[PDB]
């Protein structure tokens, strides 16, 4: 992919009339580029310009705008996908990249960077897995995580966990519950940086 998005996620605070996302063409040829929002494969947003020509080594700011055509919840975050599809101007190959957009109503309890600490973790029985509960109004997203017991480490197939919900996450290479296990993880903050955390099962 020649088109690069500035940032690995977008935060859309509800009091903003719009939010900008920047695209850059790092490649050597110009590209036709489409930008849009969807729910992850209708959506109360526009992205403009929806189609642009971005020359080599030049860029384009995309304006994302909430339309309230549908009302989003005001008591929790909502997540969307910001998509970018490039194609060089017969038959032709093209490429698509997506990053998350979190719609964040103003005034939610607590802070999003603290939501990973608030997660509760449980063994999920029998093919080991964990049940994880998010008591907060924020998504929690991870870059990686693992379970450790008796000096052995087992990667977790981490998944994003929605506000006020449970998710089960698989533990790789572990048959069943281990004694005195601990979870360690790196969640992702608004700026794409790491939030380290841990929990004892
Ligand atoms: Cl992510």
From Swiss-Prot:
Lineage: Bacteria, Pseudomonadati, Pseudomonadota, Gammaproteobacteria, Enterobacterales
Key words of the record: Chaperone, Fimbrium biogenesis, Immunoglobulin domain, Periplasm, Signal, Stress response
MF terms (GO), sorted A to Z: protein folding chaperone
Organism whose genome encodes this protein: Escherichia coli (strain K12)
Keyword Iron: no
Family annotation (Pfam families): PapD_C, PapD_N
Family: Belongs to the periplasmic pilus chaperone family.
Other observations noted: The operon is cryptic under classical laboratory conditions, but is functional when constitutively expressed.
Protein name as catalogued: Probable fimbrial chaperone YadV
GO cellular component, one term: outer membrane-bounded periplasmic space
């Amino acid at each position: 992919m020649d088109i690069v998005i500035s940032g690995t996620r977008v935060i859309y605070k509800s009091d903003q009339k719009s939010v900008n996302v920047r695209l850059e063409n790092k490649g050597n040829n110009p590209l036709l580029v489409q930008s849009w929002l969807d729910t992850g494969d209708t959506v109360p947003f526009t992205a403009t310009p929806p189609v642009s020509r971005i020359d080599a080594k030049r860029g384009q700011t995309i304006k994302l705008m909430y339309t309230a055509s549908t009302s989003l919840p005001k008591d929790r975050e909502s997540v969307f996908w910001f998509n970018v599809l490039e194609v060089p101007p017969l038959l032709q190959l093209a490429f698509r990249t997506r990053i998350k957009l979190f719609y964040r109503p103003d005034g939610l309890k607590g802070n999003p960077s603290e939501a990973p600490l608030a997660l509760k973790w449980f063994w999920s029985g029998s093919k080991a897995s964990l049940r994880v509960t998010n008591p907060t109004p924020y998504y929690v997203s991870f870059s990686s995580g693992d379970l450790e017991a008796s000096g052995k480490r087992y990667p977790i197939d981490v998944k994003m966990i929605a506000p006020f919900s449970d998710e089960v996450m698989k533990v790789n290479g572990l048959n069943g519950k281990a004694n005195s296990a601990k979870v360690h993880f790196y969640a992702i903050n608004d700026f794409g940086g790491a939030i380290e955390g841990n929990a004892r099962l």
